[PDB]
Design a protein around this ligand. Structure first.
Ligand SMILES: NC(=[NH2+])NCCC[C@H](N)C(=O)O
Ligand SMILES: NC(=[NH2+])NCCC[C@H](N)C(=O)O
Ligand SMILES: NC(=[NH2+])NCCC[C@H](N)C(=O)O
Length: 692
């Protein structure tokens, strides 16, 4: 509801803005509240050295009557010259701050004591810190000249492009930006466009888009908007909870710019901004956190009040926590209040969950729940294990959570790390030996990725019966938790290490990596069509803690021949797939071993004598293998020796007359033995399909 036509009538006469007395005007409007006829008369003929008038400052609030604030400062002098208006607006908006009290700035990140709150990402989803700043020697955004805006861009870009380490990146000016770059910044949510009706009426859109630009570091955890609403809008942000690191990164960039260029800053106002709402710290610090139980707690609102923070919607139970204050507290204090506030809120969520988890899951008492979880989790077993935690902080309840939340689970138990299989052995042993029957853990498991130990002459080089051959192995990188118990930095380290290895793959294994984070739709559809794409895990994986921080750290690798595929950090940290059209099981497995053995040599896999290769899902232990053969068999299908064969070789057929022959077992036999069995069995199914 912008009416610049009406406002211009009064502005060109330098007369009092009668629209402020329109009943349509926001009752809460600070310009309406404090621009009285006497204030107008007293200041209407005054100008700053940059020629800024009272009408220039109040115009947006007159054009846009729904304005909450409704004034912008054209320059520093505006804050003093039109003081009778600005002081009143500032001390209202920033109550209880008084200009007489003075403001204290502090951008030393060492003053902040913020041990990482939630590395495991159990509650906090993301952290963000923004500051607004303006350079010394120029007007503010509504008043800055055409040449000065350009000079500001030149000076800022000079500093930003000299940034090293995690702050290193690239500047993208808006002027002359091409279509592809524009689109990329849109996908990253880094792009800004021409100012809205509030900025327009403030004169901020002058010379658009000249002098405007966007800078971001390579990690995309640092962003600068140049010459938008203020000279600088500087943002440090990332997934997870590490606000101390976020703030430190922010300070290192801001202090350098300060060092080289200098900011507009006063004792009374702190850092000067176009909108008086952004004075003082110029800061908006925020955290996304899931605290559905904290909201109902009687101390919830007292915590927010105590730390001068606020909680709003953004995802169920997820709140955007942010600061309320900018004047009267330093930037360090804002961050510290934020840390302490979020910490207090999280602890409330933790208490409620702990209490709920202190007792046997009542829902497991329904005798119609037929999960292996229900079968083996006796109340006695529960009480005996409920108070133990792995070195990585995994509880029994973390392990059984998915089977509790999803009662229709077949199994319902996941391991958060290797230690779970031992620390919670009384549960896991029973589940492993049930699902992987007849395997016993005392038997132990033998891995074997030597493809030469497989004797597999090509069964059908024609292509008559066997349409395709596929062999997958699930693996997890040694030195880390399992998927459900991964911290943010572990997952990122795994992606980095794995991609590093995969990029060095030469020959027929050479390919490229496609991360899910920042994937454009074209690349996506390309992958979908090759059946290479995976998506967020279902409710079972969600409840197990697998989907944390999706899609960060997830990605896809394939070779140029479309015969080798790697999924990174999906259900397991590594899903490695070898595949060919035709029947050459031997070739497929040989390619698989070459890739897996090399990754093994460089990184190492999680593995035990008793469980073979470790996975967060107990069903994927041992070989962690699925060997698959798309075949056409009705003759042998109907043959009375079908059973004897499919049972002698531990294989199984399902239809998708195309059938899917896959292996039954994963523990108690090596990868070599599993492949040989598949060959030996599919062979016999062909030595009937072929007969006459
Ligand atoms: N981006 C901002 N400066 N927002 C605060 C002021 C917004 C608008 N001028 C108003 O008075 O409601
Ligand atoms: N804490 C976060 N992850 N914030 C991201 C959201 C950014 C968005 N501009 C906002 O409304 O704040
Ligand atoms: N047999 C394996 N694939 N082991 C993977 C890990 C590397 C090494 N054998 C270790 O246990 O530390």
């Amino acid at each position: 509801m912008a009416d610049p036509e009406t406002a211009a009538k009064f502005k060109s006469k330098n007369a009092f803005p009668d629209p402020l007395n329109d009943p349509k005007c926001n009752p809460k409007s600070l310009v309406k509240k404090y621009l009285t006829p006497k204030v107008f008369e007293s200041l209407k003929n005054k100008k700053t050295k940059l020629g800024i008038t009272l009408w220039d400052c109040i115009n947006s609030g007159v054009v846009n009557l729904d304005s909450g604030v409704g004034v912008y400062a054209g320059d520093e002098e505006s804050y003093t010259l039109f003081g009778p208006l600005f002081d009143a607006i500032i001390e209202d908006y920033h109550s209880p701050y008084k200009l007489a009290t003075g403001h204290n700035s502090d951008m030393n990140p060492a003053h902040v004591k913020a041990p990482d709150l939630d590395p495991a990402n159990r509650y906090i989803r993301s952290t963000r810190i923004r500051v607004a700043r303006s350079l010394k020697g120029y007007g503010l955004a509504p008043g800055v000249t055409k040449a000065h805006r350009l000079e500001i861009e030149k000076k800022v870009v000079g500093v930003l492009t000299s940034l090293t380490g995690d702050l290193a990146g690239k500047y993208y000016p808006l002027s002359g930006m091409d279509e592809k770059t524009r689109q990329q910044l849109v996908d990253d949510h880094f792009l800004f466009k021409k100012g809205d009706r509030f900025l327009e009426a403030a004169g901020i859109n002058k010379e658009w888009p000249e002098g405007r630009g966007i800078y971001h570091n390579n990690d995309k955890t640092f962003l600068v908007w140049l010459n938008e609403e203020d000279h600088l809008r500087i943002i440090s942000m990332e997934k997870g909870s590490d606000i101390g690191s976020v703030f430190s990164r922010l300070c290192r960039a801001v202090n350098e710019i300060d060092k080289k260029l200098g900011f507009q800053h006063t004792k009374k106002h702190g850092y000067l901004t176009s909108c008086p709402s952004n004075l003082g710290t110029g800061m908006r610090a925020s955290v996304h956190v899931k605290i559905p139980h904290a909201k109902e707690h009687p101390d919830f609102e007292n915590i927010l009040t105590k730390y001068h923070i606020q909680a709003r919607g953004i995802d169920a139970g997820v709140y955007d926590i942010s600061n309320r204050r900018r004047l009267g507290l330093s930037e360090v204090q804002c961050v510290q209040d934020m840390y302490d506030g979020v910490k207090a809120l999280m602890e409330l969520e933790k208490e409620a969950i702990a209490k709920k988890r202190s007792v046997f899951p009542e829902v497991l008492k329904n005798p119609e729940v037929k999960s292996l979880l229900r079968k083996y989790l006796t109340p006695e077993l529960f009480d005996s294990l409920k108070d133990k935690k792995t070195a990585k902080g995994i509880s029994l309840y973390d392990c059984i959570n998915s089977g509790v939340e999803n009662l229709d689970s077949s199994c319902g138990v996941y391991a958060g790390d290797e230690e779970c299989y031992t620390l919670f052995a009384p549960l896991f042993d029973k589940i492993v030996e049930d699902y992987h029957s007849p395997y016993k853990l005392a038997n132990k498991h033998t891995s074997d990725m030597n493809p030469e130990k497989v004797d597999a002459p090509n069964l059908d080089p024609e292509g008559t019966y066997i349409r395709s051959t596929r062999i997958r192995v699930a693996r997890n990188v040694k030195g880390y938790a399992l998927t459900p118990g991964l911290t943010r930095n572990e997952r990122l380290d795994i992606e980095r290490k794995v991609v590093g290895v995969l990029s060095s793959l030469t020959g027929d294994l050479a390919g490229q990596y496609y991360p899910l984070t920042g994937m454009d739709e074209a690349t996506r559809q390309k992958l979908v069509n090759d059946h290479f794409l995976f998506k967020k895990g279902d409710r079972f994986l969600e409840a197990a803690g697998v989907n944390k921080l999706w899609p960060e750290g997830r990605g896809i690798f394939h070779n140029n021949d479309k015969t080798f595929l790697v999924w990174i950090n999906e259900e397991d940290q590594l899903r490695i797939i070898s595949m060919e059209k035709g029947s050459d099981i031997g070739s497929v497995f040989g390619r698989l071993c070459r890739a897996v053995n090399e990754i093994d040599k460089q990184l190492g896999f999680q593995h035990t004598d008793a469980h073979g290769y470790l996975s967060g899902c107990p069903t994927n232990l041992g070989t962690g293998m699925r060997a698959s053969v798309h075949v056409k068999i009705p003759k042998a299908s109907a043959h009375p020796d079908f059973q004897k064969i499919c049972d002698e070789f531990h294989i199984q057929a399902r239809g998708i007359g195309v059938f899917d022959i896959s292996n039954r077992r994963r523990l108690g036999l090596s990868e070599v033995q599993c492949v040989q069995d598949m060959y030996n069995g599919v062979k016999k199914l062909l030595e009937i399909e072929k007969s006459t």
